[PDB]
């Protein structure tokens, strides 16, 4: 399946993607002893402005894995169709979860090459102090740079197609089509991250970004 064009997406879809990748929820050293719907983990009053936080997984084993662990969270947070747990406002999130104890000795800097229509642009940088880092966290961090510099989620920008590739030192590599949004709304867009896929930080080689114009 070839790279999806921006022109295919509803204004709402672009605004929702802009919103997700510009305002993620980022918190360190929190803990939940509460499973909901067998898959989700609940952090009471731990979200933005004291909201409740529902961290959603694809499987029950994933939730049981972090249940009652001191975790770090880094993911795309939404409200619409976030299921309430109490009468407090609830804020939702897929995956983005790793262990708080598992930190590097020194910050890992990962470089990203960037081309637009094959034209080499400035190299970009992201960081993490996590020994294990979610793929979600790094996708968010790249698309944030891309949003800032290239306006990838503005309807009227020249960027019309885009691809992000994570180049690993180990055999498996990962890829993201920036306009292959699984649907119009945050809860649909962000579901891609539910597997909680996590990379060893030392094994990441670098990132490649290819953006394309109408030309």
């Amino acid at each position, epitope marked *: 399946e070839d790279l999806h064009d921006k022109s295919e997406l509803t204004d709402l879809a672009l605004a929702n993607a802009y919103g997700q990748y510009n305002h993620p929820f980022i918190k360190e050293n929190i803990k939940s002893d509460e499973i909901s719907g067998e898959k989700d983990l609940i952090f009471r009053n731990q979200g933005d*402005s004291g909201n409740d936080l529902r961290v959603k997984f694809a499987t029950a084993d994933l939730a049981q894995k972090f249940k009652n662990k001191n975790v770090d969270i880094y993911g795309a*947070s939404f409200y619409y169709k976030c299921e309430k747990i109490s009468e407090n406002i609830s804020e939702c999130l897929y995956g983005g979860t790793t262990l708080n104890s598992e930190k590097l000795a020194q910050e890992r800097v990962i470089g990203a090459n960037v081309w637009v229509d094959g034209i080499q642009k400035e190299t970009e940088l992201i960081r993490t102090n996590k020994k294990n880092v979610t793929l979600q966290e790094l996708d968010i961090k790249i698309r944030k740079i891309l949003s800032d510099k290239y*306006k990838i*989620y503005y309807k009227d920008s020249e960027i019309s197609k885009g691809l992000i590739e994570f180049d690993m030192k180990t055999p498996r590599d990962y890829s993201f089509d920036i306009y292959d949004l699984k649907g119009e709304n945050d809860y649909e867009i962000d579901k891609i991250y539910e597997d909680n896929k996590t990379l060893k930080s030392d094994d990441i080689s670098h990132i490649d970004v290819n953006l394309y114009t109408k030309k």
Partner: T-cell receptor
Amino acid sequence: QLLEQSPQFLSIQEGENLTVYCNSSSVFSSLQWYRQEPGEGPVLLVTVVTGGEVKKLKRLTFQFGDARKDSSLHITAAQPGDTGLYLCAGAGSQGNLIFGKGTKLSVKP
Amino acid sequence: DGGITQSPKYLFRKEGQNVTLSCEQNLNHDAMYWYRQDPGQGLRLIYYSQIVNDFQKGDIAEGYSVSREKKESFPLTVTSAQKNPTAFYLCASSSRSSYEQYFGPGTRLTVTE
């Protein structure tokens, strides 16, 4: 990009709950509410940036429509000091704030 | 404890005269804005400026002009070509660390026949 605010004027007795509205046909990426005293500068109350976002600041409750097209401002147990002009403002992800015409709120003691 | 100011608070002129409205800020913001406010119209953007030496027309720039020579200061000039000069005029500034526009106290301009 056009924002419409509803109602234009509201007169209400202290102790009542009220809601005011900001509507558009366009999608907004961020939406804001300001309060203004006569012949002074508006002051920011809140900015909402995600559809379905509810923010609660004491007696005020702000909500962003799920589809990014509207916002409401709800006041619980209105008080005379809540009297003023309530201005909605919307950005869009790229280029600048457009303001509504304002709801003029008068709370009677 | 920085902020925005405007001066004078009250401005009165005969028709046919160009007039300067002053706006300073020491919040160290790059972006600055001028709005007019009319009864029942809310605020309408006249001119803005994203950084020193740069400025760009707003929704209703006809009749108005700005300069931005210094970061701190954003003079609005209401020209005799502006057909309905009488209004309440508001200046504002913002940073990219917040969505917030901070407003100056406003200046009231009345133009007499």
